[PDB]
Amino acid sequence: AHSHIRGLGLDDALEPRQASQGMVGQLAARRAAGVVLEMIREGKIAGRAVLIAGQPGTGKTAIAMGMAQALGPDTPFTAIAGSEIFSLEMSKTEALTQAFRRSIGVRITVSLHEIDVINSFLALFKSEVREQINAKVAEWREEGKIPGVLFIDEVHMLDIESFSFLNRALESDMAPVLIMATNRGITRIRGTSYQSPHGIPIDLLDRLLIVSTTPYSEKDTKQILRIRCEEEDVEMSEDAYTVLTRIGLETSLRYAIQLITAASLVCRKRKGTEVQVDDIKRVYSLFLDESRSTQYMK
Amino acid sequence: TKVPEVTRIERIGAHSHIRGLGLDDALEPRQASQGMVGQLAARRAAGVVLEMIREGKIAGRAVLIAGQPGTGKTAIAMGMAQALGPDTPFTAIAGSEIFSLEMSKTEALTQAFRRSIGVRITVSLHEIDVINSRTFLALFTGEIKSEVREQINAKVAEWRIIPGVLFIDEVHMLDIESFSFLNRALESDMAPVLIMATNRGITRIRGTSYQSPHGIPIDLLDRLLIVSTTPYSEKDTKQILRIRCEEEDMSEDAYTVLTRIGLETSLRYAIQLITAASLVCRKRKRVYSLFLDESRSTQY
Amino acid sequence: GAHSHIRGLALEPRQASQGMVGQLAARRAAGVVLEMIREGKIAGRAVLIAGQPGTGKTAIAMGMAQALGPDTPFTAIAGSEIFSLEMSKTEALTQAFRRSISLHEIDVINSRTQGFLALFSGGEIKSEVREQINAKVAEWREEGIIPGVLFIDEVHMLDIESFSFLNRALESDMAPVLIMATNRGITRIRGTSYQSPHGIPIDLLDRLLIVSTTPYSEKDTKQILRIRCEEEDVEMSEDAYTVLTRIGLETSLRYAIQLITAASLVGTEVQVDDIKRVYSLFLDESRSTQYMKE
Amino acid sequence: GAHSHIRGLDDALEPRQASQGMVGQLAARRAAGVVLEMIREGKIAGRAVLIAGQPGTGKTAIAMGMAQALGPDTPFTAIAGSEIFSLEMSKTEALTQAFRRSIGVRIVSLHEIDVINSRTQGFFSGDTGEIKSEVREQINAKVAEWIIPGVLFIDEVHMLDIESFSFLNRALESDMAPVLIMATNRGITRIRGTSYQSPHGIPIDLLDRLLIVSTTPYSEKDTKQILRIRCEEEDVEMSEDAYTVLTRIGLETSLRYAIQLITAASLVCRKRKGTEVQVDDIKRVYSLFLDESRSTQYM
């Protein structure tokens, strides 16, 4: 999904170029992310986190991926959704400690979580293990033998107790850069009867740097779609790109991206080389988007 | 000592006729073939999904069939299993089935998944779990011991199979924690094809104060291929009814009345009447007035 | 002993036979169900009797048990009974099922605290006791089990987890005939924010045969009341029967039946003044609730 | 000792206007008579009683009278529905105790035997008010080797939840169980632990097994008679004019509030170095100690 994102694509003066390092348009957010990167580099981001507020499919995840790439090539990047913390399989503490340990790298670069799994056939099936892993890593670091980026999408799904965990996590030196994202304005803090901007408590909000993403133009949507086709090794007609950019603007960038793979399959079945308007057309009528599926049910 | 040996949704036999999706070489549906009648678009879409699964492109994704009740959502899921192969395990459950006094939601879900992973010695992982457990002797909790599953998984790994299809109807009944389980399940290589179904538009996600399309979180929705089913015509209803009569082993005028009863109520209620009308006929309209449908029973 | 007279249900009902009076259509429908159960076609379906209270829903269930055979166990419970301080819903339900195969009587007899020794103590049967009982029954069956009828009244009181239990129970071959009853149309499924016909989930509803009961006429009410007087060995004046049939039609068949015993207590043949005294002494739900709304 | 005077509920089960402590309330007393003969002739088996009436209409008095009529040794325990909800013990314990207080052993209640043969008896300490299962198992064994079931009165029954009602229902299946007499002043109400409404807040399962008896409020003449009986019981002498004032205060408020004033007015009269309680004593005490109507309004 973010194969193309190779950095934030900014010049020497931390100013974004229209298309560079995989990133297309979204000038202001990429400019703001640039200031955040230099803040992280100059050691000023300490104790603070990032909130990217924007409508779905506005490169919130892409900017988080770009920040990781810009911080370094070995920098661990883990993206989770707020809802993921609520599991039948594990506690919210476990869900969160795992997301954090997946975001702290150890250059022998391997994540703390990967080291936890290795020292522990099908998902149809310990504090001590982590205590031993943390001890060996402390020994190796002292002998002289990398905190990444943690992206939390749909952050308004987290409850007050989870927010306290994130807050206490920000107090650690070895903690990764916390980047949260939402599309919500005022909402209730889960586990609370109070409303708050983005559904985040005042204590955490006061420690955040809020960045906003604007929705893409017809020209920007087409460019992102052309980049995704290259990533999936799919060739399209210029007229098919126009149809897809329209389908994307009327529905979502995610639904337009979902169609690329299906349209390529239809084109390959037709014993074809380049995906034409009729392939995108067939696939659009076959596989519904949230707007059509919910309206057909009503 | 693991010991491999059972009829599934075959016990009710409601999909006896479904022998595949009945699509040609170009993945295009024929009006009536392999038990499937009409429902061209959904069967066409299911064809693209089958080729996606075959060419290894369905990886990380699942299917959502949105449609009014009695529109072949289960039939298309049964057809996809049959099309994937003859040995392919198929298990169809309802979202509400996860909520049990007998076992946890994790157990209910791990069992539904293990019933959908076949081992070609083809027998399900769950069948192997039940056979190698301390049971009529268990007739009148329902969880399989972790140790028993650990042994079964070990012997299967040593011997090494065929991941089938898992159909979850009334999916809007599942809560946020259950959806996280399905999401994590989709990350596994040996996972079956997940096919969910609903008749709901926007609804609250259970265990949440937020509304969402089909009551599914955005995280899972973004990983789904949404297919829709349209209700059947008079001609299509009659054909499905004629297929069911053959399966259960019948005047042309009686078929006209049943096709009307089916169009005015539901295809399921019309199908329910076939067996009862046959009993009355063997003893020597009556059956419709005797056995009520949801609409009449609630109104009376 | 409210159904003492019920001795059973050409599947065409006779106006009065085997204790059953009137209720022609429902008894006719029950006949088709009995032949379905006999010919092994009722597998893995259940019955829903939808009707207003006092319309013989329990009587038809009792009649179906009697018709299936004389030995056939019959247990009638209310949905609300599953909710106990003394035992879990699983236990409450496993007991109702084991009383319908009794297997439960065998469980009680071979259990530590029983009878007076169990009378108001510090309610569940140990799993080990049931494992031993199930083993001996399996041994006896092999050396050389009659599943009965389980009636669940006020079914809309059951929650989604209890419905899952009934659903899984229907998958068993040794399971009794499940007959549920309600007087409700659309209602919320307990433990859920969704409404549904009779408060039953679609999964179970799709497996039900719905039968409906109509209320009794003046002539039908009088006949049922005359049968009950005989069963309780009570004799009444023809004028007292007229008054009771009126009291029954204005209130309920159950309240009219409740009065029979009290009028007999209140001196050879029960006259109108005895039924009159007893009516003013013992109130029915309609009058007691209206008197409180003051 | 609010029911000191109640010594029973004629030969034809017909109530006399004033006898065995009972005054007026003819119909309900008549109905209680039929219930007693039903219990005696073994017809009350599986059934219980519901007394529906406004507060202070002798619902408890009729229950006390039924116990006295059943025999002099017959145990009688009166509890309120709300009493089952305790920090000290479970609802099961609260209910098993109320039932065991209502089953007598010929020589004393089963509960009294449970307390005597239990450790913690001494004498605002810890600690659960529950009796050990083993202690009850030993007591039940000795009693089985060697029983007078009394009356259990449950007031404010609409306070019980669905699980508690299932306990009462299962209790009615026992042969050694006491006569269950419930009471309420409510019409249709929600069954606690349920989203459904029902007559008296009782489930249909239990309601279908109940004999509903209703109590009407007392007249000026009946209120005065009950108040005269209570004054004698508490050994309090009043002026005929003070009885008129109290009967008025009782009719405007409640019979319980009027009866509460008898003791306080006697204290004021004794302080005034008096013999007979006069109108001014009942008047002082009425203005000092408030009733629900005045306390809620003045609050």
Next chain:
Amino acid sequence: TKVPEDVTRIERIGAHSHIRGLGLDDALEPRQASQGMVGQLAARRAAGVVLEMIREGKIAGRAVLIAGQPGTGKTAIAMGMAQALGPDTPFTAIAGSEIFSLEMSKTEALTQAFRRSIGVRITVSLHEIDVINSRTQGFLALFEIKSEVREQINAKVAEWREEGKAEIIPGVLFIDEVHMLDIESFSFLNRALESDMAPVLIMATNRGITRIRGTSYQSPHGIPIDLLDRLLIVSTTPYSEKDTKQILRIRCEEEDVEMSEDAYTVLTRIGLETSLRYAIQLITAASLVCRKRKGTEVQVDDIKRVYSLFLDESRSTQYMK
């Protein structure tokens, strides 16, 4: 070796220092100002009848409910009843909300409030004896009593009472904001009233009809019918300008504060417009300001400064909105 001591109670906040009894004559009739009590004639008269009822052993099985608006001497009357019952009589005042603790159960919170109200004249409370004969105790306990410890304490106290070494003196337990208690807590109070060694229970509220917590039903004062039927309800009226001034003059003496007659006028106005508690809170602060000004008598400007500095509930909530 069970070890008894006393300790300062509601005396630590000292708001009822002056309350030395109910100030009633031989005929149980209140004098306008006596034993610290000022005005509130009817409630004090009613409390007198309750005292004679407790003394003549007639209060048995019953409790008191004082219904009145905040700052109408509900706590003062409870304090006065304790003082009137005797000088050694333990008095503990709690709020309904205090039963809800992260540190202990509602049962513990309530058993402690009751054991703080039963004195042992070797006079020391049963709770104080529980603390002294418990593992940690004070600073060693700094950031529930064991059942065994209470079982031993109860045994020794029973033995000493029988021998004639000790005398158990049941005091007064005041429960303010009683409508905060739930149905289970009310059942505890009800069962407590059945004990012979139980203290006099005095509850208080400012509420009329309210829901019983843990219930969907409304009820007078948020108390169930079972307990209500066992209560003697007393009501308190709000104070006049003359009564407010007198209470304030008594508090100034108690805190050893001298005020100008004009400053008393301002404070009596501030008290009538806000609350008697807020006016009393200002006495200490105004004295501090006056002492800082190198002053002798607290004047209008001292009360004025302090009023604008320290807000009352009405102003603070309005400024926030």
Next chain:
Amino acid sequence: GAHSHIRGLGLDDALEPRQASQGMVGQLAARRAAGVVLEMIREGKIAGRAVLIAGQPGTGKTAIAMGMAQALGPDTPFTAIAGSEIFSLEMSKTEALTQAFRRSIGVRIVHTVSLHEIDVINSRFLALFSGDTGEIKSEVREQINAKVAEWIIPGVLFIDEVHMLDIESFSFLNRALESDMAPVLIMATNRGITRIRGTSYQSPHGIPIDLLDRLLIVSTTPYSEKDTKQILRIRCEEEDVEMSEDAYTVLTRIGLETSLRYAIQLITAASLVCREVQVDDIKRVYSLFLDESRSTQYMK
């Protein structure tokens, strides 16, 4: 280091505040009131009582609490927490609160160290991400409390967003006020009447009457253009940032239109863009990093 400059309440001998001293700027009445509280604590009159600072966000409620700690002494521990912090997946509300209190009680060995610091040192990288919980063993605290008793400077505990605490937490604070070695409790809110959490009753500031009747309520007014500028100039010096007089005017405007906290957040970012900060640097940074008002409005 948001309160680096706060070195005391900046009051004269007569407990009267000087416009700008000991880091404190303006807020004369609240600083004056805090002075009376300090002398009340010193003269032993604050016994059993706590402080409530009611004011809109960014009105120096935390600064006045920091100033009170500094005024009480140089060794005096100061811990500031938010009500919401008590609700943790890592520890109980009791633990959260006992830790906040033990962080506020100093032990002067000559050096002062908190009771909590002594608890951590004498208890069994990267601990927040290790497992873990969070809580300190009762036995460890029992030993630490014993040795400290054998061999105490109570500080200040500031609880912001106090209306987030439930009735059980308020009972903890109430019982904590009964201890002699307890710190000065300073609570703060911006709310008028609100429900007490864990209750169906509304109350001023969401605090029960029992605790409210024991509080000394102090109010903070919002800052003027002249006061805002001065606080911002002090913060720039603390962060070693140089601004143009025109840039200070823009920042004072941005602060008055949004919040003092948002204006302070910009100082660091504007310095980074600059690397003397001019109006164009503050302008760029304002358009890049949004404040709560703009971010929520853009999302709607």
